[PDB]
Design a protein around this ligand. Structure first.
Ligand SMILES: O=C(NCCCCCNC(=O)c1cccc(O)c1O)c1cccc(O)c1O
Ligand SMILES: [Fe+3]
Length: 289
């Protein structure tokens, strides 16, 4: 299990420890640079928009356009260090895409890691949201919105067909990769209760390389597709890649249950968002119901 964030009070500040390090964080930070898109959505949900001073405008999705005029600190992968240091932030919030920059970010300001644990999603989620809320004295408000997400998950779980099984795939250029329980798309199986076609696909951020023959051999009832081409701006599109005779023979193809999930939520990985996680839950739910 990834280590949780832990905090202790010290008057004007908290001493915070997370899986990457220790940081003294001031209470009520007022210049926050946010590189995790989910947490950025949680700032919105908690009415903390005016605290944010930097965002990754190169990867800002459609549901986060209230932050389009914030100063840009680049993208989720192409972090602009000069821009960040010019802002003089009091806090920088990252997730797993930026852990490789942690030392460099920590020289600028205290840097909090809000990674989602792929093997312990819901527990991680709650700890990331509550830790942020504690910085601002908003635990109460955050608890109430967490309780809303939990109720949405119960509604989604309750309509799931225990007989039926699903395969999760990612399309990049023209190649296909598969993901299963405890991967970066694990919540489909782990939280929402959808049975997997193969429990033995045991993967993290990088998927198991397969072809359509595999998909047909497994004959899933649902295929959930995340198209990485949309995010990277490639020409290739999963609808094209999956239009072939082998995929056409699956029960998923025959029942219109090939589901193209929005990659601005699933791939860009906005699960730390109090509203964005809800939208993703509903998207699974309305696809299956
Ligand atoms: O460290 C990571 N990738 C290494 C670099 C790959 C280099 C190429 N990537 C892109 O152009 C890109 C752009 C936006 C979002 C992304 O996730 C991207 O991978 C990484 C970590 C967790 C999840 C990911 O998904 C990652 O990638
Ligand atoms: Fe990536």
């Amino acid at each position: 299990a990834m280590l949780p964030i832990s905090m202790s009070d010290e008057g004007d500040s908290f001493l915070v420890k997370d899986s990457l390090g220790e940081n003294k964080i001031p209470k009520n930070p007022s210049k926050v640079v946010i590189l995790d898109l989910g947490i950025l959505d949680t700032f919105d949900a908690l009415k903390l928009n005016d605290k944010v001073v930097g965002v990754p405008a190169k990867n800002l999705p459609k549901y986060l356009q209230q932050f389009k005029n914030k100063p840009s600190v680049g993208g989720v992968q192409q972090v602009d260090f000069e821009a960040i240091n010019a802002l003089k932030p009091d806090l920088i919030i990252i997730s797993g895409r930026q852990s490789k920059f942690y030392d460099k970010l920590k020289e600028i300001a205290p840097t909090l890691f809000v990674g989602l644990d792929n093997a312990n999603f819901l527990s991680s989620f709650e700890n990331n949201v509550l830790s942020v809320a504690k910085l601002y004295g908003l635990e109460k408000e955050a608890l109430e919105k967490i309780s809303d997400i939990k109720n949405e998950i119960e509604k989604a779980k309750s309509i799931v067909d225990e007989d039926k099984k699903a395969l999760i795939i990612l399309t990049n250029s023209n190649k296909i990769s598969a993901f299963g329980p405890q991967s970066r798309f694990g919540i489909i199986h782990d939280v929402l209760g959808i049975n997997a076609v193969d429990e033995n696909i045991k993967v993290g951020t990088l998927g198991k390389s397969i072809n359509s023959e595999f998909i047909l051999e497994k004959n899933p009832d649902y295929i959930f597709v995340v198209d990485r081409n949309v995010i990277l701006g490639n020409k290739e599109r999963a609808q094209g890649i999956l239009d072939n005779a082998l995929v056409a023979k699956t029960k998923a193809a025959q029942n219109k249950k090939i589901i193209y999930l929005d990659p601005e939520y699933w791939y860009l990985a906005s699960g730390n968002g109090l509203e964005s996680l809800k939208t993703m839950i509903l998207e699974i739910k309305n696809a299956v119901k």
